[PDB]
Symmetry: C5
C-alpha cells in the first residue's frame, strides 16, 4: 500500500545496519531459541553431526519504530536482513558454514521489535560414538555473539521446542536441554554470554 512506501522512506534514512542499536546504558536484549527438525547424518569416523534446525531470534531495534497514527493499517513490515542490523550469533563448535534454507527476511512491528526465524542446515563437531547405544550420543550446539559482549548484546533463552522433530527419522530424539552461560575470557575485559542446546539421540534399533 501507499503507506508502506512512505514508511520505507522514513525508516531508511540515517539507518545503518552495521551498528548495533544500543541506547544509553541498555544493551540490546536478544531472545534466542533452537528447534530441532532433523538429524540428517552422523559421521562416526570424523566425529560430526549434520543437523537441520529452526532458530528464533527476536530483539528490539529502537530506530525501527513508528506511530501507527501516521501510517494507518501498517502494523508490520517484511524487511530483508541485509538492510537490518542482526545479531552476529555464531555456532561456536560448527565445522561447516550455515546453509540458510528460508527467505532471508525479518518481520518488524511498529514497536521496532524484530523477528528473524531462519531454518538452517549445519554440521557440528560431536562425539557420536554413543549413537548406537541406549545412552545414545550427546552433542552440544553452542551459540553466542561473535563480537558483542554482555553489556552490548544481552543473549537470553526463550522456551525451547521439540514438537518439530520429524517422526520418520532413523534417529530417535531422546531429549534436548537448554542452558544460558556467561564467562569472562583472559582476552577481553567484558564477559560474553552463550546459549548451549544439548541434544541426545540414538539410532532406532
Amino acid at each position: 500500500g501507499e503507506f508502506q512506501r512512505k514508511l520505507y522512506k522514513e525508516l531508511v534514512k540515517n539507518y545503518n545496519p552495521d551498528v548495533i542499536p544500543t541506547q544509553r546504558d541498555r544493551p540490546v536484549t536478544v531472545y534466542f531459541s533452537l528447534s530441532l527438525l532433523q538429524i540428517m547424518d552422523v559421521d562416526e569416523k570424523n566425529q560430526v553431526v549434520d543437523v537441520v534446525f529452526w532458530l528464533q531470534m527476536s530483539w528490539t531495534d529502537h530506530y525501527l519504530q513508528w506511530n501507527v497514527s501516521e501510517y494507518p493499517g501498517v502494523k508490520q513490515v517484511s524487511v530483508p536482513i541485509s538492510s537490518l542490523w542482526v545479531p552476529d550469533l555464531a555456532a561456536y563448535n560448527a565445522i561447516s558454514k550455515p546453509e540458510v534454507l528460508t527467505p532471508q527476511l525479518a518481520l518488524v512491528n511498529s514497536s521496532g521489535h524484530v523477528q528473524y526465524l531462519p531454518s538452517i542446515r549445519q554440521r557440528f563437531s560431536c562425539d557420536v560414538s554413543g549413537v548406537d547405544t541406549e545412552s545414545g550420543a550427546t552433542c552440544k550446539l553452542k551459540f553466542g555473539s561473535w563480537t558483542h559482549h554482555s553489556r552490548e548484546l544481552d543473549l537470553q533463552m526463550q522456551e525451547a521446542d521439540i514438537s518439530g522433530y520429524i517422526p520418520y527419522s532413523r534417529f530417535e530424539l531422546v531429549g534436548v536441554t537448554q542452558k544460558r552461560s556467561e564467562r569472562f575470557y583472559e582476552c577481553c575485559k567484558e564477559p560474553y554470554p552463550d546459549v548451549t542446546f544439548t541434544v541426545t539421540f540414538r539410532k532406532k534399533g
Copy 2:
C-alpha cells in the same frame, strides 16, 4: 525499441522491490502451481527425496502497469527478478537451498501482471520407506509465504499437472494431489496460507 527504453526509465523511478504491492484492504493474490518433472534420487537412509520441478507463480503488481497508448508496441517486458518484489514462498520442509536452473527473469504485461516460472532442483525431507512396494512412497512438498499472512498474500493453487513428468525415470509417478490450508500459529492474530503437494511414487517393475 526506443519505447522499451522509455518504459524502463518510468517504471524504475519510485519502484521499491521491498514493498509488497498491496492495495488497501486488498491482499496480493499469488497463483501458484508445481509441475513435477523428475525424481532425481531417493535417500532411504536419511529420508530425503531429490526432485526437479517447475514452479508457476503469477501475481499482479500495480506499480508495474502502463498505458499502451503511450508506449505503442510494448505489450510485455522481461525483467530480472532481482529488480521486482517477488512473493517470499518458502519450501517448509526443504533440507537444501533451491538450485534455480533457468534464467531468473519474469514477464510483465501492461496490467502489471507478473509471471515468474523458474525450473528448480531441490531436496526435501520425506518418509521414502515405501518406495519399493505397490503402495509406494508418499512425499509432501509444502510451500507458503514466510512473513506475509492471509490478509497480505492470498496464495491460490492452480490445477495439478503431471504432464511434464519424464516417462523414462526409474520411478513411476502414481499421482499428485493438492491441498490449500490456512494455519494459525500461536504467535499471531492472522493465519498463514500454505499449499501442499502430495506426490506418490514407486520403483518400476
Copy 3:
C-alpha cells in the same frame, strides 16, 4: 588504446543491458550452434548425461555500432557479457546450472554484431539405458529463449560440426542432428522457437 577508451565513453551512455535491442517490428535474430566436446559421464540409474560443449551465439545490437572513421583502427572490442544484453537462452531439460568454463566476454564489431562463444559444462535429463547397445542412447539437448517469443527473438541455427569431439573418450559418437522448430505453449499468445541438438552415442568396445 585511446580510441577504444573514447568509444567506451560513447557506447556506455544510455545503454541499458536489460532491454532487448529490437528495432521496430524486426525481431533480434540470434544465431546459435552447439559443438560437443566430451561426454563426461552417464548416470544410468538417474538418467542423466554430463556434457562439456561449445556454444556459438551471434546477434546484432544496433546501439553498439560506430563509425570506424571516427575511431581509426578500432574494428572490434572485447566486452564483458555482464555489461551487455544477451539472449536469455535456456536448456529446457537441464538438471543442473550451466557451469561456464571460459572468460565471460563477447566480441563486438562496428556493425554492432556481437559474438559470445562460451564453453560450458552441464547436466541433462536423458534416457541413457541404450548406452551399451550398438544402437546406443539418444539425448536431446533443447535450447530456446525463456521469455522472448518468435517476433521478439528469432532463433536460427548455424551448421553443426563434430570435429571438436575429443577422440580419446570412452564414448563414441554414432549420430548427430541439429534442428530448429517452432512450437506453441499452453499459455502465451505467441509461438517460441527452439534449436534441438540430438546426439546418439555408445560405449566403445
Copy 4:
C-alpha cells in the same frame, strides 16, 4: 547507539580498504597465530589433510583511531572485514579455498587496533604417510603475505594454543611447533616473511 553511528560516518570518510595503513617506513606489524581445533580427514592417496582451525590475527590501522572523549560510550566497534584493509595472508600449500565458518567481523578499538579471529576449514597438501606409525605424520601449514614484503607488512607470531583441540578425535595430536621465516625470492630485493605451523599427529589405538 548514537555515538556509534556518528563514529561510523567519521571513520568511513576517505577510508580506503585497498591501502595498507603504513606510516613512514614503519611497516604495519601483523600478529598471527593458529589454534588447531580438528583434523577432519587424511587422504593417504592424494596426500592431503583436512583441518579446522582458529586464526588469531591483529594489527594497527592508524586511520581507524578516535578519541573516547569525543565518543563517550564507544571503546570498540564491530566492523565487517569487507570494509577494512586486511592482511593478504595466503596459505602457501593449500589445495582448496578456505571455508570461513564464523561471522566475517573484526573488532576495532580506539587505538585503531584490529582483531580478526576467523574459524576456518581448509585442505592442505601434506605427506600423511606416517599417520599410522608411532612416529606419526607431520604437516606444515605455511602462511604469509602474498604481495607485501618485510618492510611493508611485518608478520609476527603470537602465542600458539593447543587447548582448543577436540579430545574425541580419532587422531592423536602429538606436537605443534611454530616458526617464523624470511625468504628471498629472486624477483625482489626485500624478503617476504612467512609463519609456519608444523603439527605432528597419528591415529589412535
Copy 5:
C-alpha cells in the same frame, strides 16, 4: 601511508579496466609461465587429470604509471585484480572452472608493470590411459587469450619451473615442455597465439 592514498585517487580517475592498454603498433605483451605443483587425481574412466599449479603473468599497462618523485616512498602497490585490466587467458581443454587458491591481488610497479601470480586448482581433459606405464601419461595444458589476437595481446613464454613439484606426490613427474604457437582460426584474418605446457607423468613404484 599518505602517498599511497594520494596515488590511488590519481590512478583511479581515468582508469578503465575494460580497455586493453594497447598503443598504436604496440600489442600488450604478456609474459606467461606455469609451475606445476601437484597432480591431485587421475580419472582413467572419464579421461581427466586434476592439477594444482602456479601461473606467472606479467605485462605493462601504461595507465598505471607514476613518477616516484611526486610519490616519494612508493615503488609498488597491491591492487585487487577485479580493479585492473587482466589478460583473458583461458584454459582450452579445461573441463572445470579454475579454483583460485591465493589472494586475488596483483603487484604493480611505478613504470606500469603488473605482476599476477595466482595459485590454481583445475581439472583438464586428457588421455591418462598410460599413467601405469614406463612411458607414462602425457597431458597438454593449452592456454591462450580468448578474445584478443596477436596484434593486440602478444603472448610470450617465460622459462618454467619443476622444482615446485612435491616430492611425496603419488605421481612421479617425468618432464614438462613449453611451446608457443600461432594458430589461424579461419574466421579471423589475424592469428591467435597460445602457450602449451606438455607434462609427462606416471604412478610411482
